[PDB]
Design an enzyme around this catalytic site. Structure first.
Site, PDB file in Angstrom:
ATOM      1  N   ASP A  60     -14.010 -28.344  -8.778  1.00 37.07           N
ATOM      2  CA  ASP A  60     -14.203 -27.021  -8.312  1.00 37.07           C
ATOM      3  C   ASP A  60     -12.950 -27.202  -6.334  1.00 37.07           C
ATOM      4  O   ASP A  60     -13.727 -27.658  -5.344  1.00 37.07           O
ATOM      5  CB  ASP A  60     -15.140 -25.955  -7.771  1.00 37.07           C
ATOM      6  CG  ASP A  60     -14.886 -25.046  -7.190  1.00 37.07           C
ATOM      7  OD1 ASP A  60     -13.583 -24.688  -6.555  1.00 37.07           O
ATOM      8  OD2 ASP A  60     -15.845 -24.334  -6.033  1.00 37.07           O
ATOM      9  N   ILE A  61     -12.219 -27.727  -6.554  1.00 36.57           N
ATOM     10  CA  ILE A  61     -11.257 -28.938  -5.506  1.00 36.57           C
ATOM     11  C   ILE A  61     -10.203 -27.527  -4.696  1.00 36.57           C
ATOM     12  O   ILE A  61      -9.819 -27.140  -5.877  1.00 36.57           O
ATOM     13  CB  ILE A  61      -9.888 -30.105  -5.962  1.00 36.57           C
ATOM     14  CG1 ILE A  61     -11.263 -30.795  -6.774  1.00 36.57           C
ATOM     15  CG2 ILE A  61      -9.644 -30.925  -4.800  1.00 36.57           C
ATOM     16  CD1 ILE A  61     -12.995 -31.712  -6.350  1.00 36.57           C
ATOM     17  N   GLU A  62     -11.051 -27.009  -3.146  1.00 38.74           N
ATOM     18  CA  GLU A  62      -9.963 -25.978  -2.712  1.00 38.74           C
ATOM     19  C   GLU A  62      -8.934 -26.577  -1.290  1.00 38.74           C
ATOM     20  O   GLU A  62      -8.408 -25.988  -1.085  1.00 38.74           O
ATOM     21  CB  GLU A  62     -11.112 -25.473  -2.273  1.00 38.74           C
ATOM     22  CG  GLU A  62     -12.107 -25.206  -3.930  1.00 38.74           C
ATOM     23  CD  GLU A  62     -12.380 -23.322  -3.904  1.00 38.74           C
ATOM     24  OE1 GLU A  62     -12.277 -22.556  -2.364  1.00 38.74           O
ATOM     25  OE2 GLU A  62     -12.816 -22.927  -4.833  1.00 38.74           O
ATOM     26  N   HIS A  63      -9.182 -27.348  -1.633  1.00 33.67           N
ATOM     27  CA  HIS A  63      -8.199 -28.072  -0.032  1.00 33.67           C
ATOM     28  C   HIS A  63      -8.051 -29.585  -0.435  1.00 33.67           C
ATOM     29  O   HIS A  63      -8.482 -30.339  -1.030  1.00 33.67           O
ATOM     30  CB  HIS A  63      -9.208 -28.134   1.432  1.00 33.67           C
ATOM     31  CG  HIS A  63     -10.272 -26.569   0.844  1.00 33.67           C
ATOM     32  ND1 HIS A  63      -9.585 -25.816   1.947  1.00 33.67           N
ATOM     33  CD2 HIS A  63     -11.373 -26.346   0.647  1.00 33.67           C
ATOM     34  CE1 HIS A  63     -10.461 -24.813   2.216  1.00 33.67           C
ATOM     35  NE2 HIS A  63     -11.495 -25.487   1.411  1.00 33.67           N
ATOM     36  N   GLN A  69      -9.706 -19.597 -11.218  1.00 30.72           N
ATOM     37  CA  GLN A  69      -9.872 -17.892 -10.530  1.00 30.72           C
ATOM     38  C   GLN A  69      -8.915 -17.632  -9.956  1.00 30.72           C
ATOM     39  O   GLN A  69      -7.918 -17.359  -9.230  1.00 30.72           O
ATOM     40  CB  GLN A  69     -10.026 -18.996  -9.271  1.00 30.72           C
ATOM     41  CG  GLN A  69     -11.139 -20.065  -8.940  1.00 30.72           C
ATOM     42  CD  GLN A  69     -10.905 -20.864  -7.471  1.00 30.72           C
ATOM     43  OE1 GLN A  69     -11.622 -19.696  -6.247  1.00 30.72           O
ATOM     44  NE2 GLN A  69     -11.084 -21.775  -7.003  1.00 30.72           N
TER      45      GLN A  69
END
Length: 310
Positions: free
Chosen positions: A145-148, A203
């Site tokens: 869940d890499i978001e940055h 998402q």
């Protein structure tokens, strides 16, 4: 036959994991998060955070450097086998929203990161002399869940995990990804293109251009689940199942992205019918928001499963 996945670990005042282990409807629980990465974290060990869980103690390195890796997660350790006994898959999730400054800097540290997590959270091994933060518990896989901060290194971690999985042929393990809806995804389109995930939960909240809400109100954007199916064809993840990731309550995400169960039903009807081999089911952000969103005496997650089995 489709599945319901949900995140746990970052719910304010969340109930312990075993509560959700007891929830029939859940098929997959992603525990968030390994949120500190080795290239920039104290002692160059991964770091973890599970909200109100764990007693605050952290491991130290062989040379006495204090880490951010929690060592006293007694309730999680007790609870995971309950989920597995109930037949659920429990995946350890990497990344999450906070902090926003974590990334992988090299092929080497990508390989070493996956190696460390396999040793800490995978099968017990006599030659491992490192931390076992969940004791003898063995997770069912890892969620990305890499978001940055872009997409460097994740394909390598995924390939490394997969080679480790292939050394334990009597047990199946899983890899998943949580991209946002815009293609290309800054963090995970590279990993998806170059490595093979089992599950990809898109998402579908927080981006106006392609949200699940835009399926309901087409003036807001254009729901692009069709585009995501297409983009797989091309990829190492061609055989991945795709999930629609949704907020589990009105406040779990930015305003305007929550769908009522009837809205979900309409969406799922169309897409499960159109893509019977690729549509994998629903993912929810997140366990506490589901639990606190009781509709006719049942948490949001139960209504989601009802829709999937309908």
């Amino acid at each position: 036959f489709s599945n319901l996945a949900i995140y746990w670990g970052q719910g304010p005042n969340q109930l312990r994991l075993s509560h959700f282990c007891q929830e029939t409807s859940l098929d997959i629980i992603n525990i968030g998060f390994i949120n500190y990465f080795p290239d920039m974290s104290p002692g160059h060990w991964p770091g973890s955070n599970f909200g109100n869980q764990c007693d605050g103690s952290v491991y130290v390195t062989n040379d006495g450097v204090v880490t951010k890796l929690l060592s006293g997660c007694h309730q999680i350790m007790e609870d995971i086998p309950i989920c597995q006994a109930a037949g659920k898959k429990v995946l350890l999730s990497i990344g999450g929203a906070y902090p926003p400054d974590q990334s992988i800097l090299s092929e080497d540290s990508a390989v070493a990161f996956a190696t460390f997590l396999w040793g800490a959270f995978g099968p017990v091994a006599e030659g491992w002399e490192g931390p076992r933060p969940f004791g003898d518990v063995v997770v069912d896989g890892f969620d990305f869940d890499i978001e940055h901060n872009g997409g460097f290194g994740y394909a390598t971690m995924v390939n490394t995990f997969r080679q480790y999985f292939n050394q334990v042929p009597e047990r199946k393990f899983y890899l998943s990804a949580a991209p946002q809806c815009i293609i290309p995804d800054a963090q995970l389109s590279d990993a998806i293109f170059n490595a093979a995930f089992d599950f990809i939960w898109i998402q579908y909240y927080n981006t106006a251009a392609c949200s699940a809400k835009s399926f309901i109100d087409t003036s807001l954007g254009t729901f692009n689940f069709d585009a995501w199916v297409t983009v797989l064809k091309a990829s190492a993840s061609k055989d991945a199942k795709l999930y629609v990731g949704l907020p589990a309550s009105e406040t779990a995400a930015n305003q305007g992205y929550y769908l009522t169960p009837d809205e979900v039903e309409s969406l799922v009807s169309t897409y499960m019918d159109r893509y019977p081999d690729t549509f994998g089911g629903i993912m929810l952000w997140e366990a506490t928001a589901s639990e606190n969103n009781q509709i006719d005496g049942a948490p949001y997650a139960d209504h989601m499963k009802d829709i999937l089995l309908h």
